[PDB]
Structure formats: C-alpha cells, structure tokens
C-alpha cells in the first residue's frame, strides 16, 4: 500500500549506500 | 491482553526524530586552548583521531605527530583534572570538619500534617558521584500518615568503546524498581547508538537500537518486550534533508518466556520538505498487530506540521488514523484532526489562542489564556460568572423559603 512498499523504498535506498 | 493498536500507532508516529551522538572530552579537543560548541567539528574530530591512529600504527610520520600531540594534551588535561579533585577534597576537609554535606529534603506540597514529621528521612549525606543517578518514584494516593514515595528509578549513561576520549557506541539505561512483600514493578529501557559516517567522510548516517521490558506482578503474570531499530540519514532528496525509517517488534511473553504470545510488527517513515513558502515535517506508520484469537489487525497513522514563513507565528498541525478491523471490506474506520495556535500581546498582557478540530464529531474547541504581570485590568471579565451565581442564589433562597 503506502507504508509497506515506501517503508521499504527508504530501507532499500539506505542499503544502497552502506 | 496486548495493548490496543492505536497505542502502537501513536507510539510509532510522533514527529521527526533525531538520535544520540558522541560527546567529546573538552580538554583534549582543541588542545589546551578554550573551545566552542559545533556538532560537525566534534563529529569530525572523533573519526579523525581513529583514522590518524590507524595511519600512525601503519607508519606515516605525519600521522604520528598528530597522534602524539593529542596524547600530550590528553596527559596534561588528565593531570590537571585530578589536581582539581585534590584541591576540592582539601577545601571540603577545611570548610567542614569530619562532617559531611547534607541534601535538601523533598517537598510534597501542603498537607494536614506538621510537614517536618518525616522530613528528616530525606536529608542524607551526598556520596557525590558514583556514575548512576537515583530518583524516588511517588504514587498518586499515598498512605495517610506517611510519605508517598515507594519506588526507585536508576539511570546510567556511558560511552564504552573509546580509545582516548574518542568514543564508540553511546549507551544509556533506565530501570524503575518497586519491591515490597505484596507486589513487584520492574520497568526498563536501553538505547544504543551506532554512527556509520559523518561529513566530510560521508553523510551523517546513524542507526539506533532501543529495547524495553515491563514486569508487573501479581497483576498481569505476563511480561512485555519491545525492540525498535531505526535509521536516519541527512539527504536522499536534497542537501540537508533529515530522512529516517524504522521497524518495531513487540511481544507479550506468557509466563515470562519470549517465545510464546501475541506479537506486534510495525514500520515507520519520517521526512521534511520545503516547497514555496511552506516548510512541512511529516511522519507516517503502519502496524500489523496480532489479536488474542482473531488474527490480523492493521492500522495507519500520520502526522504533519506545516511551518510558514509569512505570518511566522501561526502553528498548524494535522493528524490522521485509519482503522482496519476484520470484515475489512466494509469496516474502514477513519479519523483526522486539525490544530491551530496563535499568540498576541495586548493591554499589558500576553494572550495565547488554540483552536482544535476533531472532525468526527464536528466540534471546535477554543481555549484562550492570558497573563498580566502589570495590573488587574484583565479582571473586568470576572463580572461574567459572578452575576449568574447570584441568579443561582436568590433562586435557591426563594426555593429555600417556600
């Protein structure tokens, strides 16, 4: 919905750095 | 037996957060000479000295100079500070004799008691410092002829894995304990902060782990565990944009065992943004709690604050919950609210106005408070309730004379 996929958009793009 | 899911939704959506950082030893940062405060400089120094230590161990005379100079300032500051401890101890042994210094007793407010009947129990010698702090914890209704305080809250705070004041892992812990022969209350909370990068070595990238536990015997006979992992970074959409994500797990362990019981899983996001003259701070969350026997229950929550340049004194906030109980196709239960505040000064007084809207029951709540530290001109409105009391007195005095 909104706070499952976009709650993993931030998780994936935080994993994209570290 | 688990708390309602609105409790978790309120707990996971409470604004834009900011984690715990490194604290610096002031005599070795800015070697000898006095300093000032700035977050980026201290964060730079902490990672800079670990880097120079690694390069100095590898060889590299330019790093060895910097690390040796830091070591010199470190030794000088440490010896100065122990000299200050010796001077303070000698001054205390001069000012009092072999006597000690005694704290103030706690003030509990007025009572129908002589108010020094038990004040001699809270005046004690200091001990000065051991690392932890204690406060007493008080209940709402105490016993009649005694002091109301029953429990003790302990607080500890440290930074364990540092090399010479260049710390690693900020850490703190808080435990409330109330023990008697009938009941037992034991609450606890711990936070651990982990720093991955600071500028100019990267962007500011910090994660934080929180754990908490709840024991309350013999009322509940189950214990409560919560764990939160949440990560923040400054950026991701533009320069200096404070974004963060996080997850939360919770359980009600049956008999104390953390392997059995109902569970709660939740995730959250935060962000800030600046478009036009509008600056907004928003956060949102979704919780997927398990019921006692019913199964999945899910909820959505969101908060927003809209800062505004022009009219820089109007505060306005918006809040939303959505509830999804079983039979989800026709039980979507929404709720949203608005809040406005403003602030004036007139007639030698400071006025503040707050307007609140709940939007399910269409009610507007207005609340104005004033404060006049100059005169009693603000009391002219006091004639409003004084008339009606008279109209409720004579009408009583008529009916009491019939």
């Amino acid at each position: 919905k909104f706070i499952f996929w976009a709650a993993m958009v931030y998780a994936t793009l935080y994993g994209n750095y570290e | 037996r688990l708390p309602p899911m609105t409790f978790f939704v309120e707990q996971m959506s409470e604004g834009v957060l900011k984690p715990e950082g490194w604290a610096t030893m002031e005599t070795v940062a800015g070697l000898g000479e006095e300093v000032t405060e700035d977050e980026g400089a201290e964060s730079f120094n902490h990672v800079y000295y670990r880097q120079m230590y690694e390069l100095a161990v590898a060889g590299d005379p330019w790093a060895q100079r910097e690390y040796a100079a830091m070591l010199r300032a470190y030794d000088k500051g440490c010896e100065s500070y122990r000299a200050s401890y010796e001077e303070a101890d000698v001054d205390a042994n001069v000012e009092y004799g072999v006597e000690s210094y005694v704290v103030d007793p706690i003030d509990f407010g007025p009572s129908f008691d002589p108010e020094d009947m038990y004040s001699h129990r809270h005046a004690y010698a200091e001990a000065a410092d051991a690392g932890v702090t204690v406060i007493p914890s008080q209940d709402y209704y105490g016993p009649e002829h005694d002091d109301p305080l029953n429990g003790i809250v302990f607080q500890y705070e440290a930074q364990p894995f540092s090399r010479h004041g260049w710390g690693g892992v900020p850490f703190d812990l808080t435990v409330c304990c109330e023990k008697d022969k009938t009941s037992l209350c034991l609450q606890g909370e711990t936070h651990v902060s982990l720093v991955h990068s600071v500028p100019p070595f990267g962007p500011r990238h910090i994660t934080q782990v929180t754990g908490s536990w709840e024991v309350l015997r013999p009322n509940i006979k189950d214990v409560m565990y919560q764990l939160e992992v949440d990560t923040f970074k400054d950026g991701l959409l533009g320069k200096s944009d404070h974004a963060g994500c996080g997850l939360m797990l919770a359980r009600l362990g049956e008999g104390g065992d953390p392997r059995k019981g109902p569970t709660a899983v939740g995730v959250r996001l935060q962000d800030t943004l600046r478009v036009g003259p509008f600056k907004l701070e928003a956060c949102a969350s979704k919780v997927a709690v398990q019921g006692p026997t019913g199964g999945k229950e899910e909820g959505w929550g969101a908060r927003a604050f809209v800062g505004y340049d022009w009219l820089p004194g109007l505060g306005m906030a918006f809040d939303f919950i959505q509830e999804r109980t079983p039979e989800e196709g026709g039980k979507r239960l929404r709720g949203y609210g608005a809040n406005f505040t403003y602030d004036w000064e007139a007639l030698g007084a400071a006025f503040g106005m707050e307007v609140d809207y709940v939007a399910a029951s269409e009610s507007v709540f207005v609340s104005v408070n004033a404060f006049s530290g100059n005169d009693y001109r603000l009391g002219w409105l006091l004639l409003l309730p004084a008339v009606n009391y008279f109209k409720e007195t004579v009408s009583s005095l008529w009916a009491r004379l019939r």
Partner: protein, 39 residues
C-alpha cells in the same frame, strides 16, 4: 554525619487536640519518639 554514618540523638513530640463540642469528638492524641545513634 561523621563521614557518613550519623551520630547523636533525635527526639520528636506531637500532640493533636480536638476542640469541637460539630461532628468530631473531643480527643487528645499524643506521640513521642526517641532515637540514639551511638558508637
């Protein structure tokens, strides 16, 4: 407090007297306590 560990003595006295001939009664309630911290 001699380096902690207090020494000395302490005495407390309290008297409560009812003055109403009103719903409460005529009473007199007295308490005395005595503590000695001896080496």
């Amino acid at each position: 407090f001699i380096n902690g560990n207090q020494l000395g003595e302490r005495m407390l006295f309290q008297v409560d007297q009812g003055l109403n001939p009103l719903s409460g009664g005529i009473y007199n309630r007295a308490t005395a306590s005595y503590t000695k911290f001896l080496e």
